[PDB]
Amino acid sequence: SMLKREDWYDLTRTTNWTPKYVTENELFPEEMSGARGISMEAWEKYDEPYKITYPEYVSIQREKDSGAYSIKAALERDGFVDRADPGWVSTMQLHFGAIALEEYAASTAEARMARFAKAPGNRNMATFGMMDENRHGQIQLYFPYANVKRSRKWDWAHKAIHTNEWAAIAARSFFDDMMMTRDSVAVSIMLTFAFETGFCNMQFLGLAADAAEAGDHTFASLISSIQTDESRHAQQGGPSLKILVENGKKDEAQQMVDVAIWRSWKLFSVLTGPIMDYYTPLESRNQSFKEFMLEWIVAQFERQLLDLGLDKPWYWDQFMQDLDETHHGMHLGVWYWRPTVWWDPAAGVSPEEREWLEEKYPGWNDTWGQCWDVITDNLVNGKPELTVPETLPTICNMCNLPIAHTPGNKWNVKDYQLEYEGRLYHFGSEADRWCFQIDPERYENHTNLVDRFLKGEIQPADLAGALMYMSLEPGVMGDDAHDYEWVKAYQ
């Protein structure tokens, strides 16, 4: 016979002891552990709510792979990819380049907690964490690798994060701040709680429904398998937060949550928002990015935050409002700067699409619509050259995304500038500036792409030079996803 899990589980995490041959601080350096003057004894109240042991893990996870890898082999000759909507293909190319290596990087972020947490329970969970993102990174390399021979852009699933292409830098700037360069307790809050629990879990659900709705099985199955792994490790920040609140530290914990949520949101507004509202074809649009945010992300945050004993972040109302705006900015920047990404962006402003946009966002045609009016006239009039750029946008110094916002009859583009030790910095929002201010030493001497341009680091110091510097060449450089087909609606 076999024991019941609950009878021996506790022994798997009864692993703390009192060092003798080295000191506690030596073995758990504050800069790696972030124990924050709360004692080993007090970190032991840490109780993961979802439990799993080694044999359960290797057995359930052997089954998940068998499934996903068999679905993939079975659909491979069919080539769904050669006849997918080109906005879908693009969604895949963007996802693979932005995330595959950052998934892999998250195994180190998990390893940080696995070695340096003072919660025995956190260390073991993070071991499984560390395994999970080993899987995510490898399966997200193995999948896109199917498509290398169809287009160099698929090589970006591996290369992106090795380049200085601006989107890759916005990715690293996020990931590194959240999970690579923070102490263990911080990583548990800022990554597993704010980003993973806060955003990934739902995002991957929506993303899996869309693959299916697009007719892309392989991908639906991949995403939705990865998604079933999430909460096993995502749950880790929860108990950390209880512990900080119950000891002196509600404000340290608040402040970390505040920063991680904004940072997340900004990434999400360029990586996800454009996709929902412009790339997925009209007849598949199930809800708007703003709808999706309100229903599946934002209320889960207030629920979580109330249960933890924390407050809504000071920037909450602004954030609500920005659901109307930011991602429309980021889409327009990405489309407009399209030879600077490695995917083909989709304009998504055919008349039917503009109607949809107008009911999801009263005011759209009056604001966002004008810029697209002008882009459209030009295209109809055989002047395509006024629809690609000749300069750089200003890049925010915190999110590394362009500082953009409401155009047209409600013009409202603002720059939250700051002079700090003889340098001028630019911020796309009030919250982005405040992330720098509460912790200037963490960001001072970082330079965004524009900074580098201005500084002399990009040579030749023109657009062709910046292309080479970002590792982009013809064949990889983005262009209009439908090749300007939506333009015939206007003639």
Binding site: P393, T394, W411, Q417, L424
Partner: protein
């Protein structure tokens, strides 16, 4: 004489980097900005005058002031706005 600024063009959606000259008047700053905005994403308004304003504090420069005299930080952000005058 070459001097970088950040153009926040009226009714555009995005601040852009625009190299001006220290010798340029505001009117010539405004012309160099418009090139990245008028007929790409903003509609000409030819019964209007392009004025240059400091973004941070809303100071309006005269059409005729040159950049050298403006007291600007490299990379300073500037509203380019539609006025009569």
């Amino acid at each position: 004489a070459t001097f970088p600024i950040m153009s926040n063009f009226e009714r555009d959606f995005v601040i852009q980097l625009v190299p001006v000259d220290t010798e340029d008047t505001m009117d010539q700053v405004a012309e160099k900005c418009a090139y990245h905005s008028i007929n790409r994403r903003v509609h000409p308004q030819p019964e209007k005058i392009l004025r240059v304003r400091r973004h941070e504090d809303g100071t309006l420069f005269p059409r005729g002031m040159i950049v050298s005299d403006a007291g600007l930080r490299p990379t300073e952000t500037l509203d380019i706005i539609f006025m009569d005058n």
